[PDB]
Amino acid sequence: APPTLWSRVTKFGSGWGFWVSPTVFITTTHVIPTSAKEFFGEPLTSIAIHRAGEFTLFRFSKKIRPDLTGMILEEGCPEGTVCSVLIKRDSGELLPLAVRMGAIASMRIQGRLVHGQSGMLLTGANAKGMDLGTIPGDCGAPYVYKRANDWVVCGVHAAATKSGNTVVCAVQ
Ligand SMILES: O=C(O)c1csc(-c2ccc(C(F)(F)F)cc2)n1
């Protein structure tokens, strides 16, 4: 995946977030540090928060990341699209896990109720464990794909089943 897309992936709370533009940051609601009153030097006062379940979008009143260009954010992707989940792991290793995307789903995973776009990992027979599949620390990592000549972001990592095969992308 292009270096600009990896540059946008930021360590945040108990997981990750993603800079869509110089002023727009998306992440998975449950990774947000619950007591936090200040983000990237800005008070809440200066920030527009849009929260729908496990998807959260922060819009800032000034350019936090002026090095970036604004890219396309869509509400999930057509069934059958292959995405990459842009996962950073211990030591500057970059793990773009391939997922075939499915339907909008409601699920119960480790007891909690989860809603978003379901997918099946294309990394192995099952994706149990950190080598072929996701771990709780990956939450907030972006789901991206290339369409003709540009790249689209269409959600953030919210959950994965015990077997690991099934993942859920929270969507705008
Ligand atoms: O809508 C919600 O608040 C929601 C849906 S699932 C969820 C969630 C998942 C995992 C965890 C973790 F602590 F285990 F990481 C904590 C909350 N929150």
CSV table of C-alpha atoms and ligand atoms in Angstrom, one decimal:
chain,number,residue,atom,x,y,z
A,1,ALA,CA,0.0,0.0,0.0
A,2,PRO,CA,1.4,3.5,-0.7
A,3,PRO,CA,3.6,5.3,1.8
A,4,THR,CA,1.0,8.3,2.1
A,5,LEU,CA,-1.6,5.8,3.4
A,6,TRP,CA,0.7,4.4,6.1
A,7,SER,CA,1.8,8.0,7.1
A,8,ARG,CA,-1.9,8.7,8.0
A,9,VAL,CA,-2.1,5.7,10.5
A,10,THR,CA,-1.6,7.2,14.0
A,11,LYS,CA,-1.2,5.4,17.4
A,12,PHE,CA,-4.3,6.5,19.4
A,13,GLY,CA,-5.6,5.3,22.8
A,14,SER,CA,-5.6,1.5,23.0
A,15,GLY,CA,-5.4,1.3,19.2
A,16,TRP,CA,-5.1,3.5,16.0
A,17,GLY,CA,-6.8,6.3,14.0
A,18,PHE,CA,-6.5,7.6,10.5
A,19,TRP,CA,-6.1,11.1,9.0
A,20,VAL,CA,-8.6,11.4,6.0
A,21,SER,CA,-7.4,15.1,5.5
A,22,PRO,CA,-5.5,17.8,7.4
A,23,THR,CA,-8.5,18.4,9.7
A,24,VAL,CA,-10.4,15.0,9.7
A,25,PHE,CA,-9.4,12.0,11.9
A,26,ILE,CA,-11.4,8.8,12.2
A,27,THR,CA,-11.2,5.9,14.7
A,28,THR,CA,-13.0,3.2,16.5
A,29,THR,CA,-15.1,4.6,19.4
A,30,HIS,CA,-14.0,2.1,22.2
A,31,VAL,CA,-10.2,2.9,21.6
A,32,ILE,CA,-10.8,6.6,22.6
A,33,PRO,CA,-9.3,7.4,26.0
A,34,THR,CA,-12.5,8.0,28.1
A,35,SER,CA,-11.1,10.9,30.4
A,36,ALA,CA,-9.4,12.8,27.5
A,37,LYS,CA,-10.2,16.6,27.2
A,38,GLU,CA,-7.4,17.6,24.7
A,39,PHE,CA,-6.5,16.1,21.2
A,40,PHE,CA,-3.3,17.1,19.2
A,41,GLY,CA,-3.0,20.3,21.4
A,42,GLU,CA,-6.7,21.3,20.8
A,43,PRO,CA,-9.5,21.5,23.4
A,44,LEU,CA,-12.9,19.7,22.7
A,45,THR,CA,-14.2,23.3,22.3
A,46,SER,CA,-12.2,23.5,19.0
A,47,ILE,CA,-13.4,20.0,17.7
A,48,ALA,CA,-16.6,18.7,16.0
A,49,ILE,CA,-17.2,15.0,17.1
A,50,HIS,CA,-19.6,12.8,15.0
A,51,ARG,CA,-20.2,9.4,16.7
A,52,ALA,CA,-22.3,6.5,15.3
A,53,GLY,CA,-21.8,3.3,17.3
A,54,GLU,CA,-18.2,2.1,16.9
A,55,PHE,CA,-17.4,4.8,14.2
A,56,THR,CA,-16.1,8.2,15.5
A,57,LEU,CA,-15.0,11.2,13.3
A,58,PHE,CA,-13.1,14.3,14.7
A,59,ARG,CA,-13.2,17.5,12.7
A,60,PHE,CA,-10.6,20.1,13.9
A,61,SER,CA,-10.9,24.0,13.6
A,62,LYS,CA,-7.3,24.1,12.3
A,63,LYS,CA,-4.9,22.0,10.1
A,64,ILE,CA,-3.3,19.4,12.4
A,65,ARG,CA,-1.7,17.5,9.4
A,66,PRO,CA,-0.9,20.1,6.7
A,67,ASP,CA,1.5,17.5,5.0
A,68,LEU,CA,-1.6,15.5,3.8
A,69,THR,CA,-4.1,15.9,1.0
A,70,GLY,CA,-7.8,15.1,1.6
A,71,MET,CA,-8.8,11.7,0.3
A,72,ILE,CA,-12.2,9.9,-0.3
A,73,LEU,CA,-14.1,8.5,2.8
A,74,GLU,CA,-17.1,6.3,1.8
A,75,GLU,CA,-19.7,4.4,3.9
A,76,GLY,CA,-18.4,0.9,3.5
A,77,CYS,CA,-17.9,-0.7,0.0
A,78,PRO,CA,-19.8,-2.9,-2.5
A,79,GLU,CA,-20.1,-6.6,-1.4
A,80,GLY,CA,-17.2,-8.6,-2.9
A,81,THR,CA,-14.6,-5.7,-2.9
A,82,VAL,CA,-11.1,-6.9,-1.5
A,83,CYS,CA,-9.8,-4.4,1.0
A,84,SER,CA,-6.4,-4.1,2.9
A,85,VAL,CA,-6.6,-3.4,6.7
A,86,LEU,CA,-3.4,-1.2,7.4
A,87,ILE,CA,-2.1,-2.8,10.6
A,88,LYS,CA,1.2,-1.6,12.3
A,89,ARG,CA,3.0,-4.3,14.5
A,90,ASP,CA,6.0,-4.4,16.9
A,91,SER,CA,9.0,-2.9,15.2
A,92,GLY,CA,8.1,-0.8,12.0
A,93,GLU,CA,6.5,-4.0,10.5
A,94,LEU,CA,3.6,-3.1,8.2
A,95,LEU,CA,0.8,-5.8,7.9
A,96,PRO,CA,-1.8,-5.0,5.1
A,97,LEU,CA,-4.2,-7.9,5.7
A,98,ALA,CA,-6.4,-8.8,2.7
A,99,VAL,CA,-10.2,-9.0,3.4
A,100,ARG,CA,-13.1,-9.9,1.1
A,101,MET,CA,-16.0,-7.6,2.2
A,102,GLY,CA,-19.6,-8.8,2.8
A,103,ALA,CA,-22.9,-7.5,4.0
A,104,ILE,CA,-23.8,-5.0,6.8
A,105,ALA,CA,-24.2,-7.3,9.8
A,106,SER,CA,-25.2,-7.2,13.5
A,107,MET,CA,-23.1,-9.7,15.6
A,108,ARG,CA,-22.3,-10.8,19.2
A,109,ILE,CA,-18.5,-11.1,19.7
A,110,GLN,CA,-17.1,-12.0,23.1
A,111,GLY,CA,-20.5,-11.0,24.6
A,112,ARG,CA,-20.6,-7.4,23.1
A,113,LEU,CA,-23.0,-6.3,20.4
A,114,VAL,CA,-21.3,-5.2,17.2
A,115,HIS,CA,-22.7,-3.5,14.0
A,116,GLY,CA,-20.8,-2.7,10.7
A,117,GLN,CA,-19.6,-4.2,7.4
A,118,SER,CA,-18.5,-7.9,7.8
A,119,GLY,CA,-15.5,-9.4,5.9
A,120,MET,CA,-13.6,-12.6,5.6
A,121,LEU,CA,-9.8,-12.6,5.9
A,122,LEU,CA,-7.8,-14.0,2.9
A,123,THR,CA,-4.6,-14.7,4.9
A,124,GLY,CA,-5.0,-18.5,5.8
A,125,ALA,CA,-7.5,-21.4,6.6
A,126,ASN,CA,-8.3,-19.6,9.9
A,127,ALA,CA,-6.7,-16.4,11.2
A,128,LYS,CA,-6.4,-17.4,14.9
A,129,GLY,CA,-3.3,-15.6,16.4
A,130,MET,CA,-1.2,-12.5,15.5
A,131,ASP,CA,0.8,-14.0,12.5
A,132,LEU,CA,-2.2,-14.4,10.0
A,133,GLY,CA,-5.0,-12.4,11.8
A,134,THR,CA,-6.0,-9.4,14.0
A,135,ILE,CA,-5.4,-8.7,17.8
A,136,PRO,CA,-7.4,-6.3,20.1
A,137,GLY,CA,-4.6,-3.6,19.6
A,138,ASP,CA,-5.4,-3.4,15.9
A,139,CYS,CA,-8.7,-1.6,16.5
A,140,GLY,CA,-9.0,1.7,14.6
A,141,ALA,CA,-6.8,0.5,11.6
A,142,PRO,CA,-8.3,1.6,8.3
A,143,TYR,CA,-9.9,-0.5,5.6
A,144,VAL,CA,-8.7,0.8,2.1
A,145,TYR,CA,-8.9,-0.3,-1.5
A,146,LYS,CA,-7.8,1.1,-4.9
A,147,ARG,CA,-10.5,1.9,-7.5
A,148,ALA,CA,-9.1,2.7,-11.0
A,149,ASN,CA,-6.5,5.3,-10.3
A,150,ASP,CA,-7.1,6.3,-6.6
A,151,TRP,CA,-7.4,4.9,-3.1
A,152,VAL,CA,-10.6,5.0,-0.9
A,153,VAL,CA,-11.0,4.6,2.9
A,154,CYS,CA,-14.3,2.9,3.8
A,155,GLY,CA,-14.1,2.2,7.6
A,156,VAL,CA,-12.1,1.3,10.8
A,157,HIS,CA,-11.4,-2.1,12.4
A,158,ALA,CA,-14.0,-2.7,15.2
A,159,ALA,CA,-14.0,-6.5,15.9
A,160,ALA,CA,-13.0,-10.0,15.1
A,161,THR,CA,-14.4,-13.5,15.9
A,162,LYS,CA,-12.7,-16.1,18.1
A,163,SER,CA,-11.8,-18.2,15.1
A,164,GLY,CA,-10.4,-14.9,13.7
A,165,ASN,CA,-11.8,-15.6,10.1
A,166,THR,CA,-14.6,-12.9,10.3
A,167,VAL,CA,-13.8,-9.2,10.9
A,168,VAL,CA,-16.1,-6.1,11.3
A,169,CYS,CA,-15.4,-2.6,9.8
A,170,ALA,CA,-17.3,0.2,11.6
A,171,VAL,CA,-18.7,2.6,8.8
A,172,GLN,CA,-19.8,6.3,8.6
B,1,LIG,O1,-21.2,0.7,21.0
B,1,LIG,C1,-20.3,0.3,21.7
B,1,LIG,O2,-20.0,1.0,22.8
B,1,LIG,C2,-19.4,-0.9,21.5
B,1,LIG,C3,-19.7,-1.9,20.7
B,1,LIG,S1,-18.6,-3.2,20.9
B,1,LIG,C4,-17.7,-2.2,22.0
B,1,LIG,C5,-16.4,-2.6,22.6
B,1,LIG,C6,-15.6,-3.6,22.0
B,1,LIG,C7,-14.5,-4.0,22.6
B,1,LIG,C8,-14.0,-3.4,23.8
B,1,LIG,C9,-12.8,-3.9,24.5
B,1,LIG,F1,-12.6,-3.3,25.7
B,1,LIG,F2,-12.7,-5.2,24.7
B,1,LIG,F3,-11.7,-3.6,23.7
B,1,LIG,C10,-14.8,-2.4,24.4
B,1,LIG,C11,-16.0,-2.0,23.8
B,1,LIG,N1,-18.2,-1.0,22.2
